[PDB]
Amino acid sequence: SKLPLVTPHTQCRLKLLKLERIKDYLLMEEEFIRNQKQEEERSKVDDLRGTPMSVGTLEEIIDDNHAIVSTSVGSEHYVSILSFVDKDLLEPGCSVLLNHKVHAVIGVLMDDTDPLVTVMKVEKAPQETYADIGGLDNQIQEIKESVELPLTHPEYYEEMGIKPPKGVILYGPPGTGKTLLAKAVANQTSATFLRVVGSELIQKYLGDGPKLVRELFRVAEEHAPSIVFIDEIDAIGTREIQRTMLELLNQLDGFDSRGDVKVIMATNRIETLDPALIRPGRIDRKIEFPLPDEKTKKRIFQIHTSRMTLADDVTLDDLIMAKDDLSGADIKAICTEAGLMALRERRMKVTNEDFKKSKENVLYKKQEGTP
Amino acid sequence: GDLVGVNKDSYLILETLPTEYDSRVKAMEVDERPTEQYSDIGGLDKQIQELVEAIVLPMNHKEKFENLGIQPP
Amino acid sequence: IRALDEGDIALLKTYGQSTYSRQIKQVEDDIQQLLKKINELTGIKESDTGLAPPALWDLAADKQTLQSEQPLQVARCTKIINADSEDPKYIINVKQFAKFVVDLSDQVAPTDIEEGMRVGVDRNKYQIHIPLPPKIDPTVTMMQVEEKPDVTYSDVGGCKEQIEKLREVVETPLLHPERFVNLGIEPPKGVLLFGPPGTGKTLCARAVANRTDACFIRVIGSELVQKYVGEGARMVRELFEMARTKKACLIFFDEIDAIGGARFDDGAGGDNEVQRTMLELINQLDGFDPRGNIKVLMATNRPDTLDPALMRPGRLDRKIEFSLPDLEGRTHIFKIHARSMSVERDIRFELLARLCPNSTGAEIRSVCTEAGMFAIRARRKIATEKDFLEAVNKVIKSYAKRYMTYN
Amino acid sequence: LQSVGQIVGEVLKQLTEEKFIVKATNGPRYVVGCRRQLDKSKLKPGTRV
Ligand SMILES: Nc1ncnc2c1ncn2[C@@H]1O[C@H](COP(=O)(O)OP(=O)(O)O)[C@@H](O)[C@H]1O
Numbered sequence: 001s002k003l004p005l006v007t008p009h010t011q012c013r014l015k016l017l018k019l020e021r022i023k024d025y026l027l028m029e030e031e032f033i034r035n036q037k038q039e040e041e042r043s044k045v046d047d048l049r050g051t052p053m054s055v056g057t058l059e060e061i062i063d064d065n066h067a068i069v070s071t072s073v074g075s076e077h078y079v080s081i082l083s084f085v086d087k088d089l090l091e092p093g094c095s096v097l098l099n100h101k102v103h104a105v106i107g108v109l110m111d112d113t114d115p116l117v118t119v120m121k122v123e124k125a126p127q128e129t130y131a132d133i134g135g136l137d138n139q140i141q142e143i144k145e146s147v148e149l150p151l152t153h154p155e156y157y158e159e160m161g162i163k164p165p166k167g168v169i170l171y172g173p174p175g176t177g178k179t180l181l182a183k184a185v186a187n188q189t190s191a192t193f194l195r196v197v198g199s200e201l202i203q204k205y206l207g208d209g210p211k212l213v214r215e216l217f218r219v220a221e222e223h224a225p226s227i228v229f230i231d232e233i234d235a236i237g238t239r240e241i242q243r244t245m246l247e248l249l250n251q252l253d254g255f256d257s258r259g260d261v262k263v264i265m266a267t268n269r270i271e272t273l274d275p276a277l278i279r280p281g282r283i284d285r286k287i288e289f290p291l292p293d294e295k296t297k298k299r300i301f302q303i304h305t306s307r308m309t310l311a312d313d314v315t316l317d318d319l320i321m322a323k324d325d326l327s328g329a330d331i332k333a334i335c336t337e338a339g340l341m342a343l344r345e346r347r348m349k350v351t352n353e354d355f356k357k358s359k360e361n362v363l364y365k366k367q368e369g370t371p
Numbered sequence: 372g373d374l375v376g377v378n379k380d381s382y383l384i385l386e387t388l389p390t391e392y393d394s395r396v397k398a399m400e401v402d403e404r405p406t407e408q409y410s411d412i413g414g415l416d417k418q419i420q421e422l423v424e425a426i427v428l429p430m431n432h433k434e435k436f437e438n439l440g441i442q443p444p
Numbered sequence: 445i446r447a448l449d450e451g452d453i454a455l456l457k458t459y460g461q462s463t464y465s466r467q468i469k470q471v472e473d474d475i476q477q478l479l480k481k482i483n484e485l486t487g488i489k490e491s492d493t494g495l496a497p498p499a500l501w502d503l504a505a506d507k508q509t510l511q512s513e514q515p516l517q518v519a520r521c522t523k524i525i526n527a528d529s530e531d532p533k534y535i536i537n538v539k540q541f542a543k544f545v546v547d548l549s550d551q552v553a554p555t556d557i558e559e560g561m562r563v564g565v566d567r568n569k570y571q572i573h574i575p576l577p578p579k580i581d582p583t584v585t586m587m588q589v590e591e592k593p594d595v596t597y598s599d600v601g602g603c604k605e606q607i608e609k610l611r612e613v614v615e616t617p618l619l620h621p622e623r624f625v626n627l628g629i630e631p632p633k634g635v636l637l638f639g640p641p642g643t644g645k646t647l648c649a650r651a652v653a654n655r656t657d658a659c660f661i662r663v664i665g666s667e668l669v670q671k672y673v674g675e676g677a678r679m680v681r682e683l684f685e686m687a688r689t690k691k692a693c694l695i696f697f698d699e700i701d702a703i704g705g706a707r708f709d710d711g712a713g714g715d716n717e718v719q720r721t722m723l724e725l726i727n728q729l730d731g732f733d734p735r736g737n738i739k740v741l742m743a744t745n746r747p748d749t750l751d752p753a754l755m756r757p758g759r760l761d762r763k764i765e766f767s768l769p770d771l772e773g774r775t776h777i778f779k780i781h782a783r784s785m786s787v788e789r790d791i792r793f794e795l796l797a798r799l800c801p802n803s804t805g806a807e808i809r810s811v812c813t814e815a816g817m818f819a820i821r822a823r824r825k826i827a828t829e830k831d832f833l834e835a836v837n838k839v840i841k842s843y844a845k846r847y848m849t850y851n
Numbered sequence: 852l853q854s855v856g857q858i859v860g861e862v863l864k865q866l867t868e869e870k871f872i873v874k875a876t877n878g879p880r881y882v883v884g885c886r887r888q889l890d891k892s893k894l895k896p897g898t899r900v
């Protein structure tokens with residue numbers, strides 16, 4: 001659980017009122033909690049599992065209540081299963097609690113292994129929203145139709161008899177908002193978000209690449225409604241690395257039924273992509289991210305400078321004008337550096353000239369080369 | 372380097388054991404004894420004779436080799 | 445410009461505030477501290493355990509069995525001494541623990557115990573009493589499909605000859621062994637599927653698995669390729685043993701190009717380990733000892749790349765080609781894909797097929813889906829021929845995607 | 852049959868004329884003593900006892 005989002009950002013008493021509303025509610029929480037049976041069930045089960053209980057691994061289930069369990073010493077024991085253990089929650093590789101004296105299975109322990117993919121499960125999408133992105137409307141509708149609508153409303157596709165699209169590639173110059181759009185769609189539909197950065201699936205170990213992608217899809221399907229993001233797919237996209245490609249392509253198209261997990265893959269060099277990975281059967285949605293135009297640039301300037309204190313003299317149009325020379329990330333860079341420049345000369349209220357010299361210096365640092 | 376069964380607490384040897392190589396190694400040996408006759412192979416008669424004189428003849432006799440003094444292949 | 449002296453930041457963050465600053469930051473710190481107080485007051489969240497619905501379980505039988513039975517350890521059997529066959533004596537290996545000489549129980553029988561055989565044993569006397577199944581590697585046993593895909597042969601379009609010839613080998617002998625045995629013929633035992641990507645090879649594998657009725661095991665290239673040496677060969681050994689356990693079995697390799705790469709040496713040893721795994725496989729398919737009732741399916745996008753020993757008949761007896769669908773095949777697959785949708789009755793599909801270039805069946809499903817999204821984005825509950833033509837245009841132009849090198 | 856086996860192990864520094872350090876096989880090392888009658892000069896680090 002998390003706090004509500006207070007949506008004035010200028011210092012106004014509306015922001016205050018929302019805040020003291022929240023304080024009121026949390027204070028009622030405090031009040032309520034401070035102003036303060038099944039011993040039969042406990043006396044049977046939690047006394048049968050006499051403390052302490054060891055933790056081991058389940059290998060096989062042989063009978064209805066008989067299973068093989070290994071422990072951290074590595075020994076193997078054919079033990080019985082007490083009736084209260086959920087059989088459907090038991091499978092090879094599962095962590096199981098065991099009676100200390102007689103090693104009898106006394107319950108399943110929720111998994112705490114596979115650390116790395118557990119970290120890349122992130123789920124920490126809520127920093128952005130479709131709000132934070134402006135002007136990418138065509139891309140927004142495309143990705144909504146491809147991945148967001150089938151997750152939010154698969155009813156349309158099931159009623160239509162349609163098997164939903166099962167792969168999306170995002171492409172364009174860097175800093176156009178591909179990663180931002182992926183995070184934003186992860187935020188709009190609260191399906192679990194999976195991110196893995198390109199080259200990081202390339203590994204020294206021969207198996208580790210395909211193994212890593214296999215376990216990532218395994219955890220994704222385990223979370224069921226999930227979105228997996230591979231940024232800079234080019235690192236793999238453009239024998240061992242080709243074998244990781246084959247693993248990913250078969251995880252996309254191949255045997256079994258994948259189900260609900262969606263795949264977003266972002267590239268900066270789409271034309272260098274190999275034909276196999278761009279599967280017409282799987283990857284039917286390619287979304288271009290062009291360099292922002294005048295309207296989009298204006299929207300990005302408003303979005304980013306919105307949280308900054310601004311003077312009256314700022315004429316945003318001369319910043320917007322000229323051509324499509326730069327992307328949204330460059331716009332954020334101009335906003336930030338204009339903030340610093342206003343800070344040096346001691347303005348907490350950035351002016352037009354600040355942005356003018358900021359864009360000039362950025363264009364100086366933008367590209368290079370002898371005449 | 373011998374296999375011996377000892378007392379489980381006092382560790383006194385009270386049995387000798389046949390040396391155990393490995394479960395896999397015991398899996399490698401043939402017990403089914405397949406049935407493909409030599410006549411079932413066609414055209415390879417020269418190679419069949421080569422293999423037979425190299426392998427089977429040292430098994431069956433050992434006299435025609437020693438009478439010469441050769442080391443069998 | 446001089447750096448920000450402490451007074452300068454002080455006045456910067458004081459003069460520029462609204463007349464609200466103090467209140468709302470203090471209120472935010474109270475937000476944080478009250479959140480932490482709530483968290484400490486409610487305590488940590490119960491992680492819990494299994495504990496199936498309460499009415500389902502327990503009975504005094506649970507505790508009675510717990511206090512009556514024995515938590516048997518598991519030991520590899522070995523070298524039945526059989527010194528006099530009136531009491532045979534056995535050797536057991538408790539992994540990472542010890543090696544013992546033991547005897548049977550009053551319950552089990554000498555015929556019930558074999559060498560190896562992965563037996564169970566008591567915890568203090570170490571007397572043997574239970575017949576346990578052998579150790580199958582979990583990452584090999586999850587490979588069994590355990591669930592048929594929702595695809596039948598009728599869903600495959602155009603490739604009548606291919607499906608007929610593949611069913612001749614993977615389905616007919618299992619379904620009708622009498623035809624082969626009474627005519628006295630040995631059916632083929634290995635079928636290779638090759639063709640361009642997206643032609644329906646994996647779809648045919650899914651259809652076979654759905655109609656197999658026998659034990660069907662999928663296999664993917666990544667599964668075999670472990671990191672440690674010999675381990676992939678080990679898994680294939682266990683996989684073929686598992687297949688032998690079943691009364692007949694079907695083995696499917698998807699994209700065998702991942703492992704079947706032709707052996708090469710001059711590349712400073714090359715990949716080698718993958719070659720070793722495919723060599724263990726090439727032996728298992730046909731080496732010493734008959735393979736058994738194991739019919740095997742491989743599909744690949746690079747038929748020429750696989751090692752010639754793997755192409756060899758007797759291991760890959762029948763090779764099938766899935767080419768780009770013809771006009772009739774394109775019409776048939778368009779029909780098949782359009783069965784599931786809510787569309788106009790008068791969609792002249794053969795027109796769409798002849799608009800299609802040399803498009804694989806994956807392209808056909810893609811254009812059908814793109815028509816689906818056209819209809820849905822139009823909110824119409826019926827897909828129209830106009831939707832199908834826009835879908836064709838979209839898919840074809842997207843695949844087509846300066847270029848002054850042209851003419 | 853009444854006989855009981857004895858744990859083998861290599862020895863280490865002698866702390867005094869009575870107390871020694873012995874590394875019992877692959878297992879852990881202990882601080883032990885000579886029985887009563889054995890030599891004392893011959894027990895140097897690296898004697899199987
Ligand atoms: N349309 C946009 N709206 C808002 N921010 C944008 C936009 N395009 C780019 N950005 C900025 O650029 C960054 C995202 O760059 P992005 O193109 O997602 O990286 P990548 O090229 O690695 O995918 C974000 O910090 C974001 O603030």
Ligand SMILES: Nc1ncnc2c1ncn2[C@@H]1O[C@H](COP(=O)(O)OP(=O)(O)O)[C@@H](O)[C@H]1O
Nearest residue numbers: 599600601641642643644645646647777805806
């Ligand atoms: N002849 C066909 N009939 C029906 N559907 C087909 C046909 N060819 C391809 N498809 C569709 O396109 C996809 C092709 O995938 P497939 O070619 O089996 O993958 P791979 O090339 O990896 O074996 C299938 O999911 C199937 O739905």
